[model samples]
Target: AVNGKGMNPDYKAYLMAPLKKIPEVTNWETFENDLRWAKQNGFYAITVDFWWGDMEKNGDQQFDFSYAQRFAQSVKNAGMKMIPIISTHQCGGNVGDDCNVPIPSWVWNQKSDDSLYFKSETGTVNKETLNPLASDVIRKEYGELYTAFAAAMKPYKDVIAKIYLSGGPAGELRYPSYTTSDGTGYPSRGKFQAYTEFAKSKFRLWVLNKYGSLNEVNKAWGTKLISELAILPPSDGEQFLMNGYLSMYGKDYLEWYQGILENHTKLIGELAHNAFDTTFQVPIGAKIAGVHWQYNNPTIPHGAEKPAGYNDYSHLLDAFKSAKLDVTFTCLEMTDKGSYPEYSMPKTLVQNIATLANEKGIVLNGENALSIGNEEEYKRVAEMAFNYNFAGFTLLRYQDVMYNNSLMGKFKDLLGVTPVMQTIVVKNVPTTIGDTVYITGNRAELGSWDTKQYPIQLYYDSHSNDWRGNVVLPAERNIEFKAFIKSKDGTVKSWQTIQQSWNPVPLKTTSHTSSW
Candidate 1:
């Protein structure tokens, strides 16, 4: 199981590329060589961007999955897993956006009405992605799009490692809270994307549902003038941030604003499940943007985060809980942006996200937001892979692997090259008819000291007359675990008197005589 260096053999290393440009340009022989190189060196998968604009550009409900098939075929041929992102958002505007991939032109035909785009507080609509208030249209169209994808990908189901559903801009499950087009760069919390009449109408309905009448609703909003018909978002966005953020009105309004995003994310996950839940056995993930900037701002705390629809990640996880979607985050290669003018704390953001995911029993995955050709950055990434038990990491691109041999070299050392067999056999472990022995440990493959993530049941051997299982562990690191007897009714019946510990020098069968 220890096929790679110190990285978990169970943890995957995936490669992502500017797929919008890869096929159009690149030397075929060299490109194929890169693919084989990654595979032979222990990479597990390739993240393919399934662009909605490129695939279904002509019109609504007209499906073309040929791009996905051809692209995926190469990864499969290279003997690597395939992680396809159903990229429903525009591509060119985000940081490190290498190529242009727009959403379907047909959807933007309604640009005049603010019906299909995110409207900032500045009144400049962001065409980069759809607005959450446009749910009826987004769900209907995206569901059909995903349905087409599942039908096309049914044959490759076995090789598909996982699925990423793009719920918003840059394929992260957050509003274009701040973007280049918005003219609100780092340190500046971008405008809220909820000023449209549709957004207001929805907000109005939500308030009416809560208070039941204009008079009570006015009391709740702490306003004397706003009748049921006049209910709207913060009229003065600045004042809302300054005074209302900690107020009853601000708290209520932010929840309402973030609620749309959560509901929208839930819908996206459910729709993907509706399509691939039955066909594809792999996990479906929702990527949350690590808006680490503005988080440390005392004046406008989490300024960049809240405007982008993440008042707190708990709201997003609340939706993930219902949808059963894994959480993926970015900027693993980063340490901190605190020194910058933005007061960015990417490392802290990552830790918080990891803690939250582990707390919720959700699998966490990661990638670098931008290229980190530095060796030090690679070390941090390697540390996080183990520290957080990240299920996987996707490098920004295959091209980076091709171009920067030295950084890739560091990557190879940290995540590639090792093979060792560690065996654990327990004897004198007593169990009743329905009681079973389970082994879990500090590592994620060992369930990260939790049984729910991975139920590791050690089978009872009739001939050996012992419970045993072979595990691949980090060869030199100290590992800790304990044996437990769990009854059929799902309760722990007994536990080993002492925790089992090992500093693996694997051949290496370690036999423990248990007393419980």
Candidate 2:
């Protein structure tokens, strides 16, 4: 869910600031310890997020890269891999907004209280917040911000610092301006304008180039190319959100919005890569041993909408595939209206993507995808990955619930790793018969050593101290063969003891030999 801030903070949040600050020192020790614990416990990778707000606090051009550098170094020093998020919006601004709307007095100058501006339906953007989508200058400004951000963090490329393209703003929901929301026009028609600097300059040029008159431009200014024409309602329908108006911005509007998002993604991904390098040069991937693509920021809908128009994984997959960039942090938005629609894809498609990732040999980050509470859906995905041989799955945001005995653990039985013996091979039976029984095989024969490695133990029962083979028993005796296997978690599995007894009724006191 959008409200959940990923994982339990108490355990992993050691990377964050101290609960009650003693001093402003790096949590290198804690991070190192955590990394070691993860690796020792068989975890695939270590992940962390890079907040856009923190990075671009001093304007987009002036980024605080030193902290990122140190963070990456610490992760490397701890001998753990990392997946860092290139977060979207800082404040309420859309992910592609020119500057940081996360802050108040930073990249923006507040206009009238009821000013109209570019709004995102996804609610990822704060409606009352500021977004400077006024012009190309702002876009360029964003480019500059990312350039610096990328350049600063470029050194960690070798350690798998995956750069996920921002899913601009909240891709799914767009919050209309407050003025539009309340059915009230701006107090001052021109004064309450929500024009971005870019929009302002573009509108001016549009008038000059097309109409050839300032009067006509002003006369038809706001209404001419009304961007939110479909949703904000006509002057006539402002009071009522009637049936026709309700579905006005329904499917088609979503499609158009997705196209806009695609545009946003192209610019962001290309710019970030070009600014730094291809991202492969950073030692982060080298240090961490792998990198995973993060699809969304704090509020973005991820690539939940599919087939381009509906924000399904199609766009995300296609984009990354085309770019040849590998990403594995797959997050599915469960609480959204489109969640069920996405689950309708055939298992074959799931298998194909899983196969694709497998061919590339990428680790599938299975976070946030299973929260739909749909067991069937989860099982299908798991099966697909299993059949295709995905490297390994790492659950996302573990600390949200219980770190130990996680929800992911319930399906361990489904992995098909449980040992099952078909038959035991016995060989080299000697032709010697006496009053003794001999059986030879130990845990070492089964390729198991110390109990710590494997608890599946076997023992030999024989009268002869050197029980290699061919038993000789006086009169009669019973022989038993058994194998016992148990998990450290205390789940024990045992084979029924196979017992055999032979009695010779004084027919041959010397010897007799039989192989079975």
Candidate 3:
């Protein structure tokens, strides 16, 4: 919380994935230096991920916390809190592709022999669908596997800051369905790996209940349906059956099949608490912002789109509270201009989460409020998120700001959170006739106009030898400009201010150049 101002002025270090390229030598030192820099620069906290893949890289389970320990200690030394995400999957690669895979091959040879068991389930196997559920032996072992890291961090839980629990992708630790097995070239489609026998049985039961029998399930689906609904055979509208049949698992299938998904994600949350004690968790709230690039439109991942009040998990926090899982933080990351088109307005995930948490008292912090591409485009829309009372803005990548020149300071000024001034030049041009110009040249004189909140029109004033525009410039910051004039008086007399989001202030017309 920002000292009663509702704004957290501190810079938050958003380390997306694990530091993969830390030279084994300066790993600890580099981590410490970064933490120290952030602390000295008024950074509120450092957010990192505790990825399983990174720690258990060898798969043999001889965990390495040398880097992690150093990283954690660096944060402590800098007097900054460490908010590490207990990540399910470390971003790219296979479900279990942890950070340690990058380590030496010698590490892989040192296998402390142990079977990775998984209680697998298959939602769909044969035409005879059991009451779908499954788990692999390793899936069961993941809970205990996480304990190793929890045990490692037990001593520093207090200064370690927050423990955010998230089940990788589907709230399940099992690897993704497909693997690049053949290695021909293209990425392999995941072969569904059901980990639990219970899920397999559940799938079978579901098939039976829905289709009356396994034969019926196969008849209405699979090869039977495909064979029956051939278009070239002149079956005449029998293909419509295929439509309804496929529609049964269609584009918005979630609209009809969310009962199970809700259960799945909830189960993931339940598993999180069962594995760790409260001492290791942040007493405040769970940080639920920027979990995914929800609005990244170019490639909308499968199983992501959901209608409002339908598949939206606005009520998931309720389940969290009910399960005695103290959900310290909750948030719904809204869209910025770059990815805004992907979201459905009116009932977007943002609005629903706002209603659920803000109006219904779900107690959410704030979703990931990212500003991508242009800050100017974000002003109007981003303000809406803040008006909804979100916790704070957690942008996706901080490296863009840390490195970019225009973005470093001026970006926050656009949010009205900081004071920044930018200067520019105006190419001097001849006005009506010859006249005495100011000693500072018309450049500094023309640069004197302040920026207003409202967007305005720009025009040239021949008499005053200046160009002018108006805007509802925010009074929070100082602004200046420079321009050149080939005429006397050197004063800017043109005036035009556009209405905010309403009317445009038209420019004046003249005989040769039209200075109306």
Candidate 4:
């Protein structure tokens, strides 16, 4: 979506599909027919997952993008756009059906002597996900995989909308909180990870950067490490409390564990950006495991006791934002059984995620795994997503929705006929570092010249060095507005002398981009 000017076609709707599930891999006629099926539906773009392990499994550090290249062609041939999801981690066992490995079997067999994988505290290796702390090895492997795919799909970049890089389990950026004793179902309890040697070294470095000396580290963590700071912080499940701060040993261990995941995500995103920039220039994004019942809490909610991990909705969202990638929030179930009524207020989980994302200046996309198992829930989720002005929403997969004609038609009606509002995106407006930009005008919605009463604050887009926001105006009307900047001390500077004018028609998708 990025151009010399900025991101284009501000609004997009995508269909998320796992490639192996798509018929194209096996049958040619089925591939063509499915492609036609997608176009006839109202899918603006097709987002598919690339099975990293399936392609390079039996080989030695080799990648094959033949299927991916052909799949890109098939998507474009069907008159639809493409969004490739890179699976850095595989689905061996999860809440969903088991899939292939993220790393090849040979790589896993090595067990970090030279290769990379997440290992448990007892030296058990997790073949499903990559150890996020293995930045050096991950960079090399991911670079090779993406570079190969990019080369094959270079000619099809025009049809490719954006790239979504998977960070961990179930293609969401998070650490594995549960371990299966028998490799299928979870034990009565769960376990936390990253107690491996690689993780410990990174943790030590992180601490040293924060507190220059071991003496200071001892003081901060309430530990007495006389020699080097070699002792790991208390990661045993009993070391931290969910509601109290007393068990943390004077250190915010919860935030520290979360910090490791956050930094790892940011590093992977940067590497993915560089890898794909060689051939494709577009918006890069990663997915987040959506709001669980205990999302805001510090505990992981596992085995006998949940461990300390920052899988909280807010923390993961902030981490993706820091990575400078667009973020998607899935698992938007709003029923009574869902997470909607978990809080005191009536606000839905989708609404809360979208609102928080906007406040943090993160471009938000949404998806639902099962469409809440009915139509009313589906419609409610769609309406909420639109009301929040989300960048896009993806229905789980093509095959499942295709099987349900009513579901497809309902989505078509919702996405196609719903009136799209006009948006005013002001980019590169002049301002000091801490200034907050606002828009005021003659319209009541724009505050009717009362800057303080109804000023619309524009959020900063750090990637493009721009202050951007969306506004909905009355139909078929011409309005004039001026941009102003408010300094940290509440001093306001007006650009009223350079007022802007626009006449946008109702029920039409229109946007005006201006740079100041």
**Most lDDT-accurate candidate:** 1
User: Which is the winner by TM-score between candidate 2 and candidate 4?
Assistant: 4
For each candidate in turn, the TM-score is 0.81, 0.46, 0.51, 0.71
Regions of candidate 1 where Cα sits further than 4 Å from its true position: 1-9, 27-29, 110-112, 337-340, 417-472, 475-516
Best candidate according to TM-score: 1
lDDT of model 4 at position 374: 62
Q: Model 1 over residues 1-516: C-alpha lDDT tens digits?
A: 011122344577788866564557675455567788887655777787888888789988777888778766666666667889999988787777777888999887754666677677878778777887888888788889999999999988877988998978889887776866677766676678887777788887887788888888777767786456667787776666667788766887888888887888789888988899888878999888888887777667777888888886866787887888988889888877674458789999988788788678788888887777677777677666665657788788777776777767777766543434566677778788988887777653455565543445677889978887665555444668887778888787877678887754343445544544
Candidate with more favorable, higher lDDT: 1 or 3: 1
Q: Report the C-alpha lDDT of model 3 over 1-516, residue by residue, as the tens digit.
A: 101011222212223323343454245565566555544433456666555556666655667777667666766776777766655443444333333322223322322321111121223222111111222322343455556767777777766654565433321212233223312111211222323443334444555566675456556544344321221111211232224324443322332233343443455455556556554654223433222222333333211222111233555545545544323222233333334433323224455555566545554443233335565433433343333444333343445454464654444443323211211112243445543221111111111222221112234456655544322222233322222232344344332121111111122221111221
Local accuracy by lDDT, each model: 0.75, 0.36, 0.38, 0.63
Q: Which portions of model 3 show Cα errors greater than 4 Å?
A: 1-30, 40-42, 59-61, 93-139, 170-201, 207-260, 281-312, 315-318, 321-347, 363-374, 377-385, 410-516
lDDT for 20 in candidate 4 is 61
Candidate 2 lDDT, 377-481, residue by residue in tens: 344434333333333344443332123444334333222122221222222222233222222222111211222332222222354322232221111222223
* RMSD in Å for model 3: 14.7
- RMSD versus native structure for model 1: 7.2
TM-score for candidate 2, residues paired by index: 0.46
Better of 1 and 4 by lDDT: 1
